[PDB]
Amino acid sequence: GIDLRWKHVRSSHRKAPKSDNVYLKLLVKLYRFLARRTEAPFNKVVLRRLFMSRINRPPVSLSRIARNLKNGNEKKTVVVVATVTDDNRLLQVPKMEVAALRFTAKARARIEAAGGRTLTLDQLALEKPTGANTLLLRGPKNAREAVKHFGFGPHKHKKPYVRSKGRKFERARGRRRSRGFKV
Amino acid sequence: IPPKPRKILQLLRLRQINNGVFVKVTKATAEMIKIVEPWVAYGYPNLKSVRELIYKRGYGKVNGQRIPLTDNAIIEENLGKYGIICIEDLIHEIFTVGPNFKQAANFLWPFKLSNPNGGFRPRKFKHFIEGGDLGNREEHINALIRAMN
Amino acid sequence: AFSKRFEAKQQLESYISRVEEIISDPTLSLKLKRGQKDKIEQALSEAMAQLEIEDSTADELKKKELALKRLVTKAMAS
Amino acid sequence: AIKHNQQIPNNHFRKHWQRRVRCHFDQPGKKVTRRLARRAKAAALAPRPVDKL
Amino acid sequence: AKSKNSSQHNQSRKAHRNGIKKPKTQRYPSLKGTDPKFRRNHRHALHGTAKALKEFKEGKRE
Amino acid sequence: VNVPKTRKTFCKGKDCQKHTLHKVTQYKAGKASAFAQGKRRYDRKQSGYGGQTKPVFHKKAKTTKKIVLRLECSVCKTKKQLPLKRCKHFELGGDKKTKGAALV
Amino acid sequence: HAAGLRSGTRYAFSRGFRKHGQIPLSTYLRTYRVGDIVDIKVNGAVQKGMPHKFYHGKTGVVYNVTKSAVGVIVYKRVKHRYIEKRINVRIEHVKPSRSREDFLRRVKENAELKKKAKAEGVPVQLKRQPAMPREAHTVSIADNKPVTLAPVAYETTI
RNA sequence: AGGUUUUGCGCGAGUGUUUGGGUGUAAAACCCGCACGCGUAAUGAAAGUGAACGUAGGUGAGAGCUUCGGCGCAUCAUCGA
RNA sequence: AGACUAAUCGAACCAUCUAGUAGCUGGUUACCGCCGAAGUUUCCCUCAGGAUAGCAGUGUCGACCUUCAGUUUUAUGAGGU
RNA sequence: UUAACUGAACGUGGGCAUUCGAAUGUAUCGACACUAGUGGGCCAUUUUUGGUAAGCAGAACUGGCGAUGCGGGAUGAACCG
RNA sequence: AGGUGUCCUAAGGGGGGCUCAUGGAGAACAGAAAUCUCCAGUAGAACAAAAGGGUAAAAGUCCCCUUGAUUUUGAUUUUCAGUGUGAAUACAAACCAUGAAAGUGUGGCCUAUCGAUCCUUUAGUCCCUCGAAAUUUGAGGCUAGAGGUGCCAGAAAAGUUACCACAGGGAUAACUGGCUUGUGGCGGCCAAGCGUUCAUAGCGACGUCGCUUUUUGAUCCUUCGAUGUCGGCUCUUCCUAUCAUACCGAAGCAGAAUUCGGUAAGCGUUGGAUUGUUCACCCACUAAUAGGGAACGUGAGCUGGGUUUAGACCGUCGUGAGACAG
Ligand SMILES: [Mg+2]
Ligand SMILES: [Mg+2]
Ligand SMILES: [Mg+2]
Ligand SMILES: [Mg+2]
Ligand SMILES: [Mg+2]
Ligand SMILES: [Mg+2]
Ligand SMILES: [Mg+2]
Ligand SMILES: [Mg+2]
Ligand SMILES: [Mg+2]
Ligand SMILES: [Mg+2]
Ligand SMILES: [Mg+2]
Ligand SMILES: [Mg+2]
Ligand SMILES: [Mg+2]
Ligand SMILES: [Mg+2]
Ligand SMILES: [Mg+2]
Ligand SMILES: [Mg+2]
Ligand SMILES: [Mg+2]
Ligand SMILES: [Mg+2]
Ligand SMILES: [Mg+2]
Ligand SMILES: [Mg+2]
Ligand SMILES: [Mg+2]
Ligand SMILES: [Mg+2]
Ligand SMILES: [Mg+2]
Ligand SMILES: [Mg+2]
Ligand SMILES: [Mg+2]
Ligand SMILES: [Mg+2]
Ligand SMILES: [Mg+2]
Ligand SMILES: [Mg+2]
Ligand SMILES: [Mg+2]
Ligand SMILES: [Mg+2]
Ligand SMILES: [Mg+2]
Ligand SMILES: [Mg+2]
Ligand SMILES: [Mg+2]
Ligand SMILES: [Mg+2]
Ligand SMILES: [Mg+2]
Ligand SMILES: [Mg+2]
Ligand SMILES: [Mg+2]
Ligand SMILES: [Mg+2]
Ligand SMILES: [Mg+2]
Ligand SMILES: [Mg+2]
Ligand SMILES: [Mg+2]
Ligand SMILES: [Mg+2]
Ligand SMILES: [Mg+2]
Ligand SMILES: [Mg+2]
Ligand SMILES: [Mg+2]
Ligand SMILES: [Mg+2]
Ligand SMILES: [Mg+2]
Ligand SMILES: [Mg+2]
Ligand SMILES: [Mg+2]
Ligand SMILES: [Mg+2]
Ligand SMILES: [Mg+2]
Ligand SMILES: [Mg+2]
Ligand SMILES: [Mg+2]
Ligand SMILES: [Mg+2]
Ligand SMILES: [Mg+2]
Ligand SMILES: [Mg+2]
Ligand SMILES: [Mg+2]
Ligand SMILES: [Mg+2]
Ligand SMILES: [Mg+2]
Ligand SMILES: [Mg+2]
Ligand SMILES: [Mg+2]
Ligand SMILES: [Mg+2]
Ligand SMILES: [Mg+2]
Ligand SMILES: [Mg+2]
Ligand SMILES: [Mg+2]
Ligand SMILES: [Mg+2]
Ligand SMILES: [Mg+2]
Ligand SMILES: [Mg+2]
Ligand SMILES: [Mg+2]
Ligand SMILES: [Mg+2]
Ligand SMILES: [Mg+2]
Ligand SMILES: [Mg+2]
Ligand SMILES: [Mg+2]
Ligand SMILES: [Mg+2]
Ligand SMILES: [Mg+2]
Ligand SMILES: [Mg+2]
Ligand SMILES: [Mg+2]
Ligand SMILES: [Mg+2]
Ligand SMILES: [Mg+2]
Ligand SMILES: [Mg+2]
Ligand SMILES: [Mg+2]
Ligand SMILES: [Mg+2]
Ligand SMILES: [Mg+2]
Ligand SMILES: [Mg+2]
Ligand SMILES: [Zn+2]
């Protein structure tokens, strides 16, 4: 006997992508070599984000990029391991160069129209193997419809599952002191 | 085993039968040992016993792994910053309680000993005074180490 | 209701006459203090009133039966 | 019998619904029939347009 | 028929199975329950002190 | 239990908004109307064959009721309602008790 | 079997022997600020702003101050998790606590004692340590001759 | 048939050809568009009204980047508009 | 005599509605590997049954955060066996 | 808030590491999502209630059987290892 | 061991003067006990009620003025899922009460005294809708109370079956077996006294220690997809706490007849009247007519009188169907 609390405990994070895209398999091979034989911490972070599922790689927008292109960051390279989306509100698009997993049709057109350049994760490794002069970005993880229903309960101000919304669907008892109590 | 004495044995790194560790006696640790009386036997080592244990059963914790110590390069790589570079320094630090005793003792993996050669007493779960084997026996623990080592 | 109320009316009258014997004899009153004496007669005053009134029901009459008994029995016992 | 956080169900399946089910396996067969009827009608009205103003 | 009434035999072991979790303390506690009169004035106080420190670049230089 | 015929308390009138003398009167429920929506629906449910269609209460346990006082402002004729506790004998405007004049 | 608000408090809330009567008046002259460490001790005479019997003896942190009461934060242990509780207590029940005074005394002493050494230039060994085993010494038997003892025979007292 | 969370895939402020029409080597495959569904704006019983003081804010932590001074994603707490 | 009415009677026999409902008995089909329970809280015409919290598994993300603990020591409070 | 720039909370600037201020361990850090079985329990040391008593009925802290073989008690779910 | 479905315009709120229960010594009628005066008096009194806590220039008592038992909504504590109901604590914004003033007051000194959805009814603003457009009736909405569920988180509800049915339960009774031995039965220890005299020939009060499972209780572990449930007849064997027989020891044993004890289960222990009886009670014989076990031995061994299906009669009970260890 050995009197241990835990035994044969597995890891908690993905160690390989669950997707079977052939091109993505090549991209993992490249960065798996780079991370092993380079001291730059930028390579290790990029490798893990390639494994993540779609809900853990939310899209980023052109507006969110322009937000972080201020206060002395107008000359750096934006790297986004996700999709990049055009924003209809932004009327004037600044000049930037972006390395992203994929672009929408309109986002690619508007970036190069202003005088920018659209890169690729493989071309990024060819130009900046150590990731110098780069900034990483993420999308809003919690900006999803399904997250609003998480942890429903009294005094929590969450969203309920209703087949429709109106005065006939819930409200009533338990939502106003005029009928019993409130939550 | 009751829940409180079990937790103390976990903090002393004694999770298996016939294990052994070095501890320096203070008021903070003397009370911990007195709680787990009917589970352990302890005493005062001499120069030979500490010397034999390190040479024959000496293993070191390196990156969370049990690496047998057979070359001086292993000891220096992990205890060099405290001034210990050889296996004679490790023995000196343990035997004469030194300023860096805590790091030296925690480096050693808990010792694993075999059953004693001559056997125990007729009933080995009384106190040493009554005629058993568990408890404090002062210098008489050297004889027990010879058999179990 | 006519029978149930009428039954409780007699029992309440019986105990009021019953307790008058204890307070009247000199033997029991000799060792019993005034402070206990005047509290019994104070409780007896409003007991007389509700017999005259007609709105009293079985619940009200029965409640004061045990209330009067509980008060007097504490003095005699101790 | 609700057991967890669910949406309250309303499935109108308590009559004998199985007696009235209308599968559509004749979607392509019917289309061929209409095209045969249109060109037959157009042949009868040789120089005239098929429709009306 | 009759059955056991109540028990507490295995509750302590169940609770300690994956720890008794103490909520984490943190630098800025909430101001829920504090009396409103001090709460109203504290709002005006912080509004001014931000403006004054903002003017530190073209102004008071305290 | 007796309460005074008059008392002065807060009045929520549009122009009073202060303490003012009030008259005290007991509250009495009105007659049930014959054209309310609840009554009109109930009448239709009972027509034709089928019998009794809604429950009839039988197991009563309470012996008393809560007393509600209806007040009236002496200026703006505004009214208020104040509930009381449960009591058996209630009357308002009775004579006050006397202290120290015990006699049988 | 009943569960009232004050059930089982026959001896907890009672005043002691020869301690009934007037409340010492220095209680109302104390002052409190948020973040102070106070401990609760219920006084039987005052019947307003009296906390539940669970908090009689616990220690908490002030979080609100009002005209005649303070708000205290204490941690309650429901089965398998802790919960934060906020209670309102009249000042007749609270009292400043000496739990933290040893720490506050030691930090002031450490700062000044370290300052003088840095000017002088000697290590201090300031942090505390548990009791250590005794050291060697000598005991003389001059005019302290030992006396011999022995067990005593059985004897009947009564 | 209708819900819900998780995995893979396409397009992305949009998305869905197939009720239907054109066509065919004919129950396959390929092509076309007007409407419509869900999403892009909430809140009240209702008449109704309808989202920028600030580089889309202030403070404490934050991976990574950096001219070494600093700039600070996601998310957590807190005070405001 | 609850007797008899085709070996059937305290309500005949034949087909259909009908695969009538069951909080109750019985059964429920190849192999290997890793983790591993509960008979307890609150409510119910509830006590052979359900919902709710707990104990359990799997999928992960945030940092590798130096944070943590069924423990001892030192200082200081509460209790009525 | 005070007779009062006297206080109160939140702040700008500055000073204090040569040693971030008890022991031991860290073979297991924090947060979230979805869901299975269970809700008849029984035995023993110490404390203990009703009963003449029971292999009887009812509780508190902890360890066990149920869900578990192996070596001793000849045999024997719970005892010793 | 006890308590609650109430009671109160003050028994609620503010202020002020005074000190209680009881005891000692005194005064016309006057006494154990009426009213008056002085001294002592830590609560031994009083505070609506059950019990516990709390209170002395008061929280008790008398006197003076009053209605914070009011208006608008939020946060917190106890039971707890940190849901509801009940009750409770601390502030904020208004309007008042009391006092010279600081201050105190959001019902009763603290711990119990109570109630959803739907429907009905009253108060409030002068507000929203009746969908082709106006004006008055009527109806419907929004905010706060009341009418009630005591099985009190809240269905609308009388019996019988001995003519009976189905799904299940040894989670639950009626019989054996098992643990226990209170009651039942049987046996010891101490020695006040009885026995003419003399505690112990033969007995034994007041107390106290055990054994047995042929009495009856207590428990509900094994059997409800079944272990055939009273008694007698018949037949075998075992136990000893010995009725007779063999051989002996004691006496208040002269003989005869009896009484107490030991080794001993080898051998015997009956025929009839009444009752279904087990149990019992009389007649007669005899060396003697002892007590028990074996699934309360023994139904594919018998018998079927009793109990315990369906037919029928009486008495008491029930309006009735029907009930009764009559
Ligand atoms: Mg092994
Ligand atoms: Mg309503
Ligand atoms: Mg050998
Ligand atoms: Mg041995
Ligand atoms: Mg149970
Ligand atoms: Mg267990
Ligand atoms: Mg009306
Ligand atoms: Mg209505
Ligand atoms: Mg009609
Ligand atoms: Mg009808
Ligand atoms: Mg009709
Ligand atoms: Mg209790
Ligand atoms: Mg106390
Ligand atoms: Mg589906
Ligand atoms: Mg569209
Ligand atoms: Mg609208
Ligand atoms: Mg960093
Ligand atoms: Mg018949
Ligand atoms: Mg036939
Ligand atoms: Mg026939
Ligand atoms: Mg028929
Ligand atoms: Mg049929
Ligand atoms: Mg079927
Ligand atoms: Mg069937
Ligand atoms: Mg396995
Ligand atoms: Mg395992
Ligand atoms: Mg039951
Ligand atoms: Mg079962
Ligand atoms: Mg888990
Ligand atoms: Mg005591
Ligand atoms: Mg006690
Ligand atoms: Mg249950
Ligand atoms: Mg469940
Ligand atoms: Mg059971
Ligand atoms: Mg079950
Ligand atoms: Mg057993
Ligand atoms: Mg038990
Ligand atoms: Mg049992
Ligand atoms: Mg085992
Ligand atoms: Mg074995
Ligand atoms: Mg044995
Ligand atoms: Mg009782
Ligand atoms: Mg008053
Ligand atoms: Mg007063
Ligand atoms: Mg006064
Ligand atoms: Mg007292
Ligand atoms: Mg409870
Ligand atoms: Mg709550
Ligand atoms: Mg509550
Ligand atoms: Mg006030
Ligand atoms: Mg009072
Ligand atoms: Mg109060
Ligand atoms: Mg109501
Ligand atoms: Mg209703
Ligand atoms: Mg109109
Ligand atoms: Mg119309
Ligand atoms: Mg009603
Ligand atoms: Mg209930
Ligand atoms: Mg229903
Ligand atoms: Mg059983
Ligand atoms: Mg016996
Ligand atoms: Mg004599
Ligand atoms: Mg004798
Ligand atoms: Mg006797
Ligand atoms: Mg028996
Ligand atoms: Mg049985
Ligand atoms: Mg059976
Ligand atoms: Mg069988
Ligand atoms: Mg048989
Ligand atoms: Mg016979
Ligand atoms: Mg014999
Ligand atoms: Mg004999
Ligand atoms: Mg024989
Ligand atoms: Mg015969
Ligand atoms: Mg027997
Ligand atoms: Mg038999
Ligand atoms: Mg037979
Ligand atoms: Mg028989
Ligand atoms: Mg047989
Ligand atoms: Mg017969
Ligand atoms: Mg019959
Ligand atoms: Mg028949
Ligand atoms: Mg009759
Ligand atoms: Mg009969
Ligand atoms: Zn008015």
DSSP for A34-93? HHHT---HHHHHHHHHTT--GGGS--EEHHHHHHTS-SS-TTSEEEEEEEEE--SS--S-
CA-to-CA distance for E47 and E31, rounded, in angstroms?
A: 17
Chain centroid to CA F71: 11
Give the resolution value in Å.
2.9
CA-to-CA distance for D8 and A162, rounded, in angstroms?
A: 7
Find residue G75's DSSP bridge partners.
G84
What contacts A160, CB < 8 A, 6 or more positions away?
Answer: A149, A152, A170
Q: Is F16 annotated as a binding residue?
A: yes
Report in angstroms the alpha-carbon separations of C41 from A84, C35, C46, C50: 96, 11, 9, 15
Q: How far apart are the first and last CA of chain G?
A: 49
3-state class (DSSP) for residue A20: coil
Chains D and F touch (3+ CB pairs under 8 A): no
Distance C19 CA to ligand 64 centre (A): 50
CA-to-CA distance for C61 and C69, rounded, in angstroms?
A: 13
In 3-state terms, chain E is what percent helix, strand and coil (to 5)? 50, 0, 50
Q: Which ligand places an atom closest to the C-alpha of E1? A: 27
Report in angstroms the alpha-carbon separations of C38 from A52, C18, C35, C72: 90, 17, 6, 11
Closest partner residue to A152 (CB to CB) among D5, D7, D8 is D5
R_g (Cα) of chain C, nearest Å = 14
CA-to-CA distance for B108 and G116, rounded, in angstroms?
A: 40
B16: contact with A, CB 8 A cutoff: yes
Find residue F21's DSSP bridge partners.
F8
**What's the one-letter identity of residue F32?**
A
CA-to-CA distance for E46 and E40, rounded, in angstroms?
A: 11
Cross-chain Cβ contact B16/A4 below 8 Å: no
Of C46, C48, C39, the residue nearest C70 (C-alpha): C39
Could you tell me where the beta strands, DSSP code E, fall in chain C?
none
CA-to-CA distance for G88 and G72, rounded, in angstroms?
A: 7
Question: Which nucleotide's C1' is closest to A72 (Cα)?
Answer: H71
Residues 12-41 of F with CB under 7 A from strand K: 12-14, 17-19, 27, 29-33, 35-39
Distance G19 CA to ligand 52 centre (A): 25
CA-to-CA distance for F23 and F7, rounded, in angstroms?
A: 7
User: DSSP per residue over D19-43, as a string?
Assistant: GS------HHHHHHHHHHHHHHHHH
What contacts B77, CB < 8 A, 6 or more positions away?
Answer: none
Min CA distance, B84 vs chain A (Å)? 30
CA-to-CA distance for B45 and B137, rounded, in angstroms?
A: 11
- Which residue is closest to K52 in terms of CA–C1' distance? G10
Residues A144/A159, Cβ–Cβ less than 8 Å: no
Residues B133/B121, Cβ–Cβ less than 8 Å: yes
Question: Which nucleotide's C1' is closest to F55 (Cα)?
Answer: K156
Total Cβ atoms within 10 A of residue G68: 10
Report in angstroms the alpha-carbon separations of F22 from F3, F12, F14: 13, 12, 16
What contacts A155, CB < 8 A, 6 or more positions away?
Answer: A183
Residues G37/G97, Cβ–Cβ less than 8 Å: yes
Q: Is F87 annotated as a binding residue?
A: no
Residues A131/A40, Cβ–Cβ less than 8 Å: yes
Chains B and A touch (3+ CB pairs under 8 A): yes
Report in angstroms the alpha-carbon separations of B6 from B3, B15, B16, F6: 5, 9, 12, 77
CA-to-CA distance for G117 and E8, rounded, in angstroms?
A: 59
Question: In the structure, how far is the CA atom of residue G5 from the C1' atom of nucleotide K88, in angstroms?
Answer: 9
Question: Which nucleotide's C1' is closest to G9 (Cα)?
Answer: K53
Cross-chain Cβ contact F89/C55 below 8 Å: yes
Cross-chain Cβ contact B16/A3 below 8 Å: yes
3-state class (DSSP) for residue C18: helix
Total Cβ atoms within 10 A of residue A5: 7
C60 touches strand K (CB under 7 A): yes
Distance A181 CA to ligand 58 centre (A): 20
Report in angstroms the alpha-carbon separations of F4 from C9, F24, F26, F94: 33, 8, 12, 8
Pick among E16, E34, E38 to test the G interface (most G CBs inside 10 A): E34
**CB-count exposure of residue D46 (10 Å: 0-12, 13-18, 19+):** exposed
What contacts A138, CB < 8 A, 6 or more positions away?
Answer: A58, A60, A82
CA-to-CA distance for F22 and F77, rounded, in angstroms?
A: 9
Residues F78/F72, Cβ–Cβ less than 8 Å: yes
Query: Would you say the C-alpha torsion B30, B32, B38, B42 has a positive or negative sign?
Result: negative
- As ranges, strand J nucleotides with an atom below 7 A of a protein CB are 8-12, 16-19, 21-36, 40-43, 57-64, 81
Question: Which nucleotide's C1' is closest to G123 (Cα)?
Answer: J19
Total Cβ atoms within 10 A of residue C12: 17
Min CA distance, G127 vs chain B (Å)? 15
What contacts D43, CB < 8 A, 6 or more positions away?
Answer: none
A137 touches strand H (CB under 7 A): yes
Report in angstroms the alpha-carbon separations of A48 from A141, C11, D39: 16, 92, 64
Report in angstroms the alpha-carbon separations of D25 from D22, D29, E60, G157: 9, 8, 85, 114
CA-to-CA distance for G60 and G97, rounded, in angstroms?
A: 10
The CA-based diameter of chain C, rounded to the nearest angstrom, is 43
3-state class (DSSP) for residue F82: strand
Of C70, C74, C59, C55, the residue nearest C15 (C-alpha): C70
Chain centroid to CA E50: 24
Residues C49/C61, Cβ–Cβ less than 8 Å: no
CA-to-CA distance for B48 and B95, rounded, in angstroms?
A: 10
Total Cβ atoms within 10 A of residue A84: 25
CA-to-CA distance for A49 and A27, rounded, in angstroms?
A: 12
Two tokens, residue F95: 């004579």
3-state class (DSSP) for residue A118: strand
Helix (H) or strand (E) holding A7: none
Total Cβ atoms within 10 A of residue B108: 21
User: DSSP per residue over A140-176, as a string?
Assistant: -TT-SGGGGGTT--TTS------SS-STTSS-STBBS
Of F84, F89, F16, F19, the residue nearest F6 (C-alpha): F19
CA-to-CA distance for G128 and A64, rounded, in angstroms?
A: 54
Report in angstroms the alpha-carbon separations of D5 from A156, A163, A164, A169, A170: 15, 14, 16, 17, 15
**CB-count exposure of residue A31 (10 Å: 0-12, 13-18, 19+):** buried
Residue with tokens 């209308």: D22
CA-to-CA distance for B133 and G50, rounded, in angstroms?
A: 57
**What's the one-letter identity of residue D30?**
K
Two tokens, residue C58: 């079985």
Two tokens, residue D29: 């067969």
Helix (H) or strand (E) holding G105: helix G101-120
Residue with tokens 């149930």: C4
Q: Which ligand places an atom closest to the C-alpha of A12? A: 29
- As ranges, strand I nucleotides with an atom below 7 A of a protein CB are 18, 34-36, 38-41, 47-48, 50-52, 54-56, 59-63, 68-81
Find residue F22's DSSP bridge partners.
F7, F73
Helix (H) or strand (E) holding E14: helix E11-15
**CB-count exposure of residue C78 (10 Å: 0-12, 13-18, 19+):** exposed
CA-to-CA distance for G21 and G41, rounded, in angstroms?
A: 17
Question: Which nucleotide's C1' is closest to D27 (Cα)?
Answer: H27
Q: Over A21-45, what HEC string results?
A: CHHHHHHHHHHHHHHHCCCCHHHHH
Strands B65-68 and F65-73: unpaired
Find residue G73's DSSP bridge partners.
G61, G86
Min CA distance, G132 vs chain E (Å)? 35
CA-to-CA distance for A38 and A45, rounded, in angstroms?
A: 13
Question: In the structure, how far is the CA atom of residue G153 from the C1' atom of nucleotide K189, in angstroms?
Answer: 37
Helix (H) or strand (E) holding B82: none
Total Cβ atoms within 10 A of residue A43: 20
Cross-chain Cβ contact B17/A4 below 8 Å: no
Helix (H) or strand (E) holding B59: strand B59-62
Total Cβ atoms within 10 A of residue B120: 15
Of G123, G121, G119, the residue nearest B99 (C-alpha): G123
Strands G59-65 and F18-26: unpaired
Count of alpha carbons within 13 angstroms of residue B76, beta-carbon side: 5
F70 touches strand K (CB under 7 A): yes
How wide is the angle at C-alpha E34 spanned by C-alphas E32 and E39, nearest 5°?
A: 100
What contacts A25, CB < 8 A, 6 or more positions away?
Answer: A17
Of B19, B23, B50, B45, the residue nearest B34 (C-alpha): B23
Residues A130/A44, Cβ–Cβ less than 8 Å: no
Report in angstroms the alpha-carbon separations of A160 from A107, A181, B26, G71: 36, 18, 60, 35
Cross-chain Cβ contact C45/F89 below 8 Å: no
Query: In residues, how long is chain E?
Result: 62
Residues A114/A93, Cβ–Cβ less than 8 Å: yes
Strands A97-103 and A117-119: parallel
Could you tell me where the beta strands, DSSP code E, fall in chain F?
6-11, 18-26, 65-73, 79-87
Two tokens, residue A85: 């989306």
Structure determination technique employed: cryo-EM
3-state class (DSSP) for residue B62: strand
3-state class (DSSP) for residue B131: coil
Chain centroid to CA E15: 25
Cross-chain Cβ contact B25/G131 below 8 Å: no
The CA-based diameter of chain D, rounded to the nearest angstrom, is 71
- Which residue is closest to J24 in terms of CA–C1' distance? B11
Closest partner residue to F63 (CB to CB) among C45, C55, C59 is C59
Query: Would you say the C-alpha torsion B47, B136, B39, A5 has a positive or negative sign?
Result: negative
How wide is the angle at C-alpha D39 spanned by C-alphas D38 and D45, nearest 5°?
A: 95
E60 touches strand J (CB under 7 A): no
Of C40, C38, C39, C60, the residue nearest C50 (C-alpha): C60
- Angle between helix B87-95 and B47-57 (nearest 10): 140
Ion ligand 4 neighbours, Cβ < 5 Å: B 122
3-state class (DSSP) for residue F62: coil
CA-to-CA distance for E7 and F15, rounded, in angstroms?
A: 64
Of G77, G66, G73, G106, the residue nearest G87 (C-alpha): G73
Residues G71/E10, Cβ–Cβ less than 8 Å: no
Residues B34/B23, Cβ–Cβ less than 8 Å: no
3-state class (DSSP) for residue A122: helix
Report in angstroms the alpha-carbon separations of B129 from B45, B123, B145: 19, 12, 19
CA-to-CA distance for A120 and A127, rounded, in angstroms?
A: 10
